Paper text:
Insulin is a small protein hormone composed of chain A (21 residues) and chain B (30 residues), and it exerts its biological effects by binding to the ~340 kDa tyrosine-kinase type insulin receptor (IR). Insulin plays a central role in mammalian biology, and has a widespread impact on blood glucose levels, lipid and protein metabolism, cell growth/differentiation, and life span2. To achieve the stabilization of a specific conformation of the hormone, we developed the strategy of inserting a covalent bridge between specific sites at the B24–B30 C-terminus of the insulin B-chain, i.e., an intramolecular side-chain:side-chain crosslinking. The evidence for the structural impact of the crosslinking in the analogues reported here comes from three crystal (analogues 2, 10, 11) and two NMR (analogues 8, 12) structures.
The long (i + 5) separation between clicking groups was first chosen to assure a wide and gentle sweep of the main chain conformation, i.e., to minimize its structural strain, and to allow the B23–B30 chain to attain a conformation similar to the B26-like turn, or to the bend of the hormone observed in the insulin:IR complexes. However, the IR-A affinities of all of B24–B29 crosslinked analogues 1–5 were negligible (<1%), regardless of the R/S permutations of the Cα chirality of the crosslinking precursors (propargylglycine and azidonorleucine). The B24–B29 linker spans a long stretch of the B-chain, strongly affecting the local and global conformation of this inactive analogue. First, the linker significantly increases the mobility and disorder of this part of insulin, and it is well defined in only one of four independent hormone molecules in the crystal, with one B-chain untraceable after CysB19. Although the triazole part of the linker (in the most ordered molecule) occupies roughly the PheB24 site of the native insulin, the B23–B30 main chain is very distorted (e.g. 3.8 Å difference at the B25 Cα atoms from the native hormone). However, it seems that not the increased dynamics of the B20–B30 chain but a peculiar conformation of the large B24–B29 ‘macrocycle’ of this analogue abolishes its IR-A affinity. Any modeling of analogue 2 (or its B24–B30 part only) on the insulin:IR complex leads to large clashes of the B24–B29 loop with the L1 surface of the receptor, or its αCT segment. This extensive steric hindrance occurs despite the general, and reasonable, match between the triazole moiety and the PheB24 site on the L1 domain. However, it is also possible that the polar character of the electron-rich triazole ring is incompatible with the PheB24 hydrophobic binding pocket (Asn15, Leu37, Phe39 and Phe714) on the IR. Therefore, the lack of any IR-A affinity of analogue 2 likely can result from both the disruption of the B24 site (on insulin and IR), and an unfavorable conformation of the large B24–B29 macrocycle on the αCT-L1-domain.
Residue numbers in the entry:
A (entry chain B): 1 to 27
B (entry chain F): 2 to 30
C (entry chain A), D (entry chain E): 1 to 21
Write the structure that this text describes.
Amino acid sequence: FVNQHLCGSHLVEALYLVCGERGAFYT
Amino acid sequence: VNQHLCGSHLVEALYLVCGERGAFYTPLT
Amino acid sequence: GIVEQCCTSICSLYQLENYCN
Amino acid sequence: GIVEQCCTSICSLYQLENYCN
């Protein structure tokens, strides 16, 4: 199934995707 | 981390990015 | 924080974007 | 298309946004 909760590596990948070259608070 | 978006993870990425608007990849809400 | 907003609950693109930069 | 761009390779946010409604 598709999980709409973002946990672990899926949360980390999601930050890469949405922030892009910005990087983020957890970089 | 795996940076590729495949399978259920590609559908989830679209849910996240496209919001409730939907998308052309699959007929989800 | 991010864990409660995005893992426990469901978060939006904009909420996730608040952790950028 | 989007599988080649984002699954086989790595895609940016703009590339996924091209598929949105």
